[PDB]
Amino acid sequence: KTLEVWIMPNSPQPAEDFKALVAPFEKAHGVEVKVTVLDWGVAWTKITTAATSGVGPDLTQLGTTWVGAISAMGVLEPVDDVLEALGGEKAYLPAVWRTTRLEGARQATAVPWFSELRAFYYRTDALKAAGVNPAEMFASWQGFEAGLARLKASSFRDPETKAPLAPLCTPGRTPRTLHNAAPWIWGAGGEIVRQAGGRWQSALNSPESLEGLYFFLSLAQKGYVPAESLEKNTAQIEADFQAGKCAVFASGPWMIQRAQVPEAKGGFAERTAAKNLGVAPYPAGPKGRYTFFGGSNLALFNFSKNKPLAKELLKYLGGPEAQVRYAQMTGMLPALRSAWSDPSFQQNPLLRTFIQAAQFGRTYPSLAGWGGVENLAVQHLGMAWDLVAQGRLTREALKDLMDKASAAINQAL
Ligand SMILES: OC[C@H]1O[C@@H](O[C@@H]2[C@@H](O)[C@H](O[C@@H]3[C@@H](O)[C@H](O)O[C@H](CO)[C@H]3O)O[C@H](CO)[C@H]2O)[C@H](O)[C@@H](O)[C@@H]1O
Ligand SMILES: [Cl-]
């Protein structure tokens, strides 16, 4: 018998790493495990096409936020037996457990594979030279703005580029998701959707959510984000941080591993940023401190010919040995709570900060219509970034854009 698994590029050699991870399972169950690697760019499409055609792999990886959508199409096997077999609900963070099913469904459709959440990477050299205490800059919004002001003013020059560093690199194209903006919405006491008397509605136009977005977008108006960044996406900003063009930017724990690996295998060990890398959690806003908590689950398609064998593989990948090994190869965090206690995570100081940030990780409701709701949100936010490009953003103009987003989102639900 043979299994097919579809994954995303979770590690630098993503196929090789997965083949090594499941070698003991291949040997132990006497089976070959064919893996196919989909860019995040087109994974939504390949997976959805397998769901409607009823042709594809036994297992697929899923972004946490996609489980509701795929579940609702009626193409996923229940996996209660696999979750029970791994310790059930108590074995996982509640922000991870939320993403095992369609919101409000009897049965689980996804087994948690790994987690990732966002924190600030910073240049320890740049902050030291501007006399900014990282604990102070990342403690509060007031601290954050004050650090960027000191960072804008500093004479410091990257020793490779001999040029300044821009204080903050954040993208301001159309976002593809609200991963970058959600923490500011949450930090201010806001949220994207509110569950009121059974149905969900937009909360993007609440006073608290508009104070969060406007704080985030206002950092660009105050010139802590350079013009050219308002034309870039997350990948090109990662390049800019790695290349010594900016002091601070938000990403997931993969950059820690990327810093120990040389330029010629997708890493940045050779760069000044790699020998001067700090990490801090999102600053606390008025109503507290939050980051985007996501990652990926594995799902079994209900048309698989190899269901027994494929649930065995799910028990394996979802369980303690495989959870530790995959996390070392990817730089992600294990989805299984137990497996965080491994020495290999406790002795990396930068990873400790992401492990701590997990307590303030927030996720989205696992909704059939989530992707639609995020598209309306980011399309309207994108027109607020256009106002920033022009130096014309106001609280009024942002309220008006989020009111149109809200009216569309209430409809979509
Ligand atoms: O919104 C869909 C889905 O997004 C997922 O977040 C991913 C990021 O994790 C991913 O980041 C890449 C790393 O996973 C990869 O290993 O390294 C590269 C570069 O070294 C990173 O870009 O990037 C994609 C966009 O390219 C994001 O979608 C979330 O985990 C999940 O919660 C969500 O459902
Ligand atoms: Cl954004």
Q: What is the 3-state secondary structure (H, E, C) of the chain?
A: CEEEEEECCCCCCHHHHHHHHCHHHHHHHCCEEEEEECCHHHHHHHHHHHHHHCCCCCEEEEEHHHHHHHHHCCCECCCHHHHHHCCCHHHECHHHHHHHCCCCCCCCCCEEEEEEECEEEEEHHHHHHHCCCHHHHCCEHHHHHHHHHHHHHCCCCCCCCCCCCEEECCCCCCCCCCCCCHHHHHHCCCCCEEEECCEEEECCCCHHHHHHHHHHHHHHHCCCCCHHHHHCCHHHHHHHHHHCCEEEEEECCHHHHHCCCCHHHCCCCCCHHHHHEEEECCCEECCECCEEEEEEEEEEECCCCCHHHHHHHHHHHCCHHHHHHHHHHHCCEECECHHHHCHHHHCCHHHHHHHHHHHHEECCCCCCCHHHHHHHHHHHHHHHHHHHHCCCCCHHHHHHHHHHHHHHHHHHC
Strand partners, 336: 92
Q: Is the CB of 385 under 6 A from ligand 1?
A: no
Q: Is the CB of 64 under 6 A from ligand 1?
A: yes
The sign one gets for the Cα dihedral 162, 166, 171, 172 is negative
Which three-class secondary structure state does DSSP give residue 180?
Answer: coil
Residue 295 alpha carbon, nearest atom of ligand 1: 30
Closest of 317, 324, 369 to residue 61, by C-alpha: 317
Residue 331 alpha carbon, nearest atom of ligand 1: 16
C-beta neighbour count of 166 within 10 angstroms: 23
The sign one gets for the Cα dihedral 217, 221, 225, 228 is positive
Residues 254 and 117: beta-carbon distance below 8 Å: no
DSSP state of 157: -
Closest of 7, 6, 29, 14 to residue 316, by C-alpha: 29
Q: What dihedral angle (degrees, nearest 10) is formed by the CA atoms of 235, 237, 240, 246?
A: -160
**Residue boundaries of the structural domains of the chain:** 1-117+292-366, 118-291+367-413
Alpha helices by DSSP H, listed for 159-206, are: 182-187
**What is the C-alpha separation between 290 and 364, in angstroms, rounded?**
13
Residue 64 alpha carbon, nearest atom of ligand 1: 34
Q: Which experimental method was this entry solved with?
A: X-ray
Q: Is the CB of 331 under 6 A from ligand 1?
A: no
- List the resolution, Å: 2.8
Q: Nearest-5° angle of CA 273, CA 296, CA 186?
A: 70
Q: Is the CB of 374 under 6 A from ligand 1?
A: no
Q: Is the CB of 294 under 6 A from ligand 1?
A: yes
Residue nearest to atom 22 of ligand 1 (CA): 235
Residues 295 and 64: beta-carbon distance below 8 Å: yes
DSSP state of 281: P
Residue with tokens 């890398």: 277
Q: Closest ligand to 96 CA?
A: 1
Contacts of 75 (CB under 8 A, 6+ apart): 50, 51, 54, 301, 302, 303
What angle do the packed helices 370-389 and 395-412 form, to 10 degrees?
160
**What is the C-alpha separation between 274 and 261, in angstroms, rounded?**
9
